[PDB]
Design a protein around this ligand. Structure first.
Ligand SMILES: OC[C@H]1O[C@@H](O[C@@H]2[C@@H](CO)O[C@](O)(CO)[C@H]2O)[C@H](O)[C@@H](O)[C@H]1O
Ligand SMILES: OC[C@H]1O[C@@H](O[C@@H]2[C@@H](CO)O[C@](O)(CO)[C@H]2O)[C@H](O)[C@@H](O)[C@H]1O
Ligand SMILES: OC[C@H]1O[C@@H](O[C@@H]2[C@@H](CO)O[C@](O)(CO)[C@H]2O)[C@H](O)[C@@H](O)[C@H]1O
Ligand SMILES: OC[C@H]1O[C@@H](O[C@@H]2[C@@H](CO)O[C@](O)(CO)[C@H]2O)[C@H](O)[C@@H](O)[C@H]1O
Ligand SMILES: OC[C@H]1O[C@@H](O[C@@H]2[C@@H](CO)O[C@](O)(CO)[C@H]2O)[C@H](O)[C@@H](O)[C@H]1O
Ligand SMILES: OC[C@H]1O[C@@H](O[C@@H]2[C@@H](CO)O[C@](O)(CO)[C@H]2O)[C@H](O)[C@@H](O)[C@H]1O
Ligand SMILES: OC[C@H]1O[C@@H](O[C@@H]2[C@@H](CO)O[C@](O)(CO)[C@H]2O)[C@H](O)[C@@H](O)[C@H]1O
Ligand SMILES: OC[C@H]1O[C@@H](O[C@@H]2[C@@H](CO)O[C@](O)(CO)[C@H]2O)[C@H](O)[C@@H](O)[C@H]1O
Ligand SMILES: OC[C@H]1O[C@@H](O[C@@H]2[C@@H](CO)O[C@](O)(CO)[C@H]2O)[C@H](O)[C@@H](O)[C@H]1O
Ligand SMILES: OC[C@H]1O[C@@H](O[C@@H]2[C@@H](CO)O[C@](O)(CO)[C@H]2O)[C@H](O)[C@@H](O)[C@H]1O
Ligand SMILES: OC[C@H]1O[C@@H](O[C@@H]2[C@@H](CO)O[C@](O)(CO)[C@H]2O)[C@H](O)[C@@H](O)[C@H]1O
Ligand SMILES: OC[C@H]1O[C@@H](O[C@@H]2[C@@H](CO)O[C@](O)(CO)[C@H]2O)[C@H](O)[C@@H](O)[C@H]1O
Ligand SMILES: OC[C@H]1O[C@@H](O[C@@H]2[C@@H](CO)O[C@](O)(CO)[C@H]2O)[C@H](O)[C@@H](O)[C@H]1O
Ligand SMILES: OC[C@H]1O[C@@H](O[C@@H]2[C@@H](CO)O[C@](O)(CO)[C@H]2O)[C@H](O)[C@@H](O)[C@H]1O
Ligand SMILES: OC[C@H]1O[C@@H](O[C@@H]2[C@@H](CO)O[C@](O)(CO)[C@H]2O)[C@H](O)[C@@H](O)[C@H]1O
Ligand SMILES: OC[C@H]1O[C@@H](O[C@@H]2[C@@H](CO)O[C@](O)(CO)[C@H]2O)[C@H](O)[C@@H](O)[C@H]1O
Ligand code: NI
Lengths: 149, 150, 149, 149
């Protein structure tokens, strides 16, 4: 059920800022190269492709900060306990991205294919190699795993 | 695994075994037909992340390019066959709305029409366009997309 | 200045139906494998990429039948003497297609990559291998030529 | 025949570094917001879509530094007097980019959609909004002009 969200170009992973097992609400999601249980994710299916990206350790899920239905470019991604249909994402493992219900994608802030550790993540409509993500085994960061099962 | 219909997106016709038998013979052609019934239900058996077997639910037989070659050429017919091996691996791309073979070609209606008539055969072809799009829907509601990977 | 409009997948060319030096107004544009002076074309630049696709022998130009600004899918292509901005096209020699001012493309009617002789042409929004065209020398149908100079 | 090479996302233009009427061989090509006669370009057609990107004031043309047929990502763009088929580019005014004979594109170094003045340019194969260019009138930087005539 658990997987790592790996920035495709850099090999860094999605983390709660601070890497806590229980991040506070509205904790920013960053990219970091470390692997540990506090950066594992799960995907709770809600409606076919749509569901919640769940931080495994805490159970909080990925939100655009503020929870708007149509967040603008550069809206920061955070973890928050609330469940609602503005926190709906799809894990596009064919095109290798993470898309929000309103159509923008998870990006590293600043759009780099080699973002340093602690780089924030934001929503943005653009499509390029720096917004690509693959979903891999916690025991083997190079083995893709099916997030939907 | 979830049961679903394979619906040609532009026309609304569905993937069927030729003749619509509950136990198609090996190498029975896969065709498009407008009817819905239990003998055109499919399932998807995951083998390796995105890759798996497109399984005819009534018979247990799975989708093959005729002849089972690793890299089948354009116009290779799709058929049902009991054998399981890695040349019968497909992925159900429900984001781009197609069915892609392990070697990179897609399931097409033979002739590539967006309105193929009943009994039109299906073939492998590398082209991507409107006429090779498929969506995966509920046997109870042909307009409701369902998740085939669980 | 003169070039052939070659259906990229089949090698057939754009012709006035009947192959006449002076096609009547609203004569259909068809695909035919023959080469001769009555299927030569020119391009009259009007505004950067936009211009008139001119039948060389007659001076008539390519119109969507009826001259509408936003012709629907399957609108037939014809030759007509009139000049106006609803007959504006662009010769996209990078993506290999012919695009109308309102954004649809010249297609073989029926969308075949191997259309028979006398197949009509129509406007259609779809993009695929059967709507591709390249622009070649009247003396060598495999030598691309610049239509904008 | 003369035009400005405008970075589409930022509005900055291609310049010879230092802005000289006679840049020395292997002078870097940079982006800068100024307009003046020493950043005007022309395009000398050689083979259909392929030609030389000519600095109007000096007559030198755009090269990948070193003039190799298949330059790698991050090869700097410069001006050089020599004319040969490794300095062949095409001005894709449909997809809005500048492509080299071997298939890579002119990029701002660093791939920003808002590169600051003096940012160098390099070859890179990636396609995204930061490598888009449009070609405009020296008298009106928003009016696209046909570079091929
Ligand atoms: O931001 C994610 C990263 O957080 C690190 O944890 C921080 C340590 C450094 O280890 O110092 C603190 O700031 C205060 O205790 C931690 O929050 C993790 O070590 C990284 O693995 C990573 O998760
Ligand atoms: O950050 C994700 C969370 O955003 C909340 O929205 C904020 C509310 C608190 O409700 O106060 C604001 O800061 C100003 O209106 C909101 O942006 C949502 O209520 C949460 O459900 C969650 O999406
Ligand atoms: O293949 C079409 C698919 O469109 C999805 O919805 C799109 C959203 C994502 O929520 O972004 C857009 O592109 C712009 O609003 C939507 O069209 C559907 O959820 C899928 O079921 C599917 O129809
Ligand atoms: O934050 C995500 C976005 O980052 C952009 O990259 C910034 C460029 C704009 O190209 O200018 C900077 O601010 C400094 O170079 C970049 O950090 C991307 O262009 C967007 O596509 C998007 O990823
Ligand atoms: O090819 C798929 C279709 O097969 C039909 O079954 C054929 C009937 C028509 O009912 O006549 C035969 O050719 C001889 O019995 C059948 O094989 C199904 O009725 C359709 O639902 C469809 O499955
Ligand atoms: O059509 C799918 C099946 O094709 C078989 O391959 C055929 C063999 C039988 O082995 O006889 C031929 O017709 C001539 O070599 C093959 O095309 C596969 O063995 C099956 O596993 C299956 O893929
Ligand atoms: O896009 C990356 C993915 O590529 C898949 O392999 C592709 C095969 C499908 O097996 O079709 C090609 O396009 C033709 O070569 C392959 O690139 C992988 O199975 C995926 O894991 C993934 O890496
Ligand atoms: O069989 C699938 C393929 O069908 C092609 O369509 C045929 C065209 C060629 O375009 O000529 C015909 O034979 C008669 O018009 C078509 O049936 C598609 O071009 C291919 O993309 C593919 O779908
Ligand atoms: O439709 C374009 C084609 O028209 C042919 O001309 C017709 C001849 C056949 O030669 O018989 C007519 O229908 C009556 O005279 C002609 O209009 C051309 O020969 C072809 O080259 C082609 O242009
Ligand atoms: O077919 C191209 C031509 O279409 C004409 O439009 C037709 C008018 C004539 O004005 O009468 C109709 O048949 C019915 O309204 C029109 O479709 C244009 O006037 C021509 O300029 C030309 O575009
Ligand atoms: O890529 C931008 C270009 O768009 C052209 O306008 C497009 C028309 C053609 O007029 O077809 C559309 O796609 C329909 O919406 C237009 O966006 C401009 O003529 C070009 O100058 C250029 O801006
Ligand atoms: O007329 C141009 C259009 O032709 C379509 O092709 C027709 C298909 C629909 O797919 O059904 C037929 O009528 C018979 O097979 C085809 O002639 C294309 O799909 C369109 O893209 C367009 O080219
Ligand atoms: O690099 C392109 C820019 O060059 C500037 O010229 C430099 C001036 C600043 O005016 O100071 C120097 O570094 C030393 O003389 C110049 O090389 C141009 O003024 C800009 O218009 C621009 O071309
Ligand atoms: O920078 C563009 C120029 O590159 C030259 O190639 C360099 C020669 C100088 O002739 O010496 C080197 O530095 C060592 O091999 C070359 O990289 C070309 O000769 C010029 O034609 C021009 O392309
Ligand atoms: O439509 C295909 C075109 O290919 C061009 O050449 C391509 C070059 C750019 O020169 O980069 C590639 O993509 C890989 O090297 C080439 O295929 C031709 O110049 C065009 O005439 C045209 O054939
Ligand atoms: O030099 C042109 C290339 O710039 C890349 O951007 C660099 C990113 C990686 O995206 O890491 C940096 O070095 C610092 O953030 C960027 O300058 C682009 O990704 C390439 O597409 C290309 O444009
Ligand atoms: Ni794939």
């Amino acid at each position: 059920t658990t997987f790592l969200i790996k920035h495709k170009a850099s090999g860094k992973f999605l983390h709660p800022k601070g890497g806590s097992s229980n991040p506070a609400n509205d904790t920013n999601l960053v990219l970091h190269s470390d692997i540990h249980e506090r950066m594992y994710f799960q995907f709770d299916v809600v409606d076919e492709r749509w569901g919640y990206i769940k931080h495994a350790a805490s159970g909080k899920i990925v939100h655009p900060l503020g929870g708007k239905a149509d967040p603008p470019n550069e809206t920061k991604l955070v973890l928050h306990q609330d469940r609602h249909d503005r926190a709906l994402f799809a894990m596009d493992f064919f095109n290798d991205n993470i898309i929000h219900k309103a159509g923008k994608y998870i990006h590293p802030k600043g759009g780099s294919t080699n973002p340093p550790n602690e780089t924030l993540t934001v929503m943005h409509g653009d499509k390029h190699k720096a917004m690509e993500f693959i979903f891999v085994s916690p025991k083997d960061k190079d083995k893709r795993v099916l997030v939907y099962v």
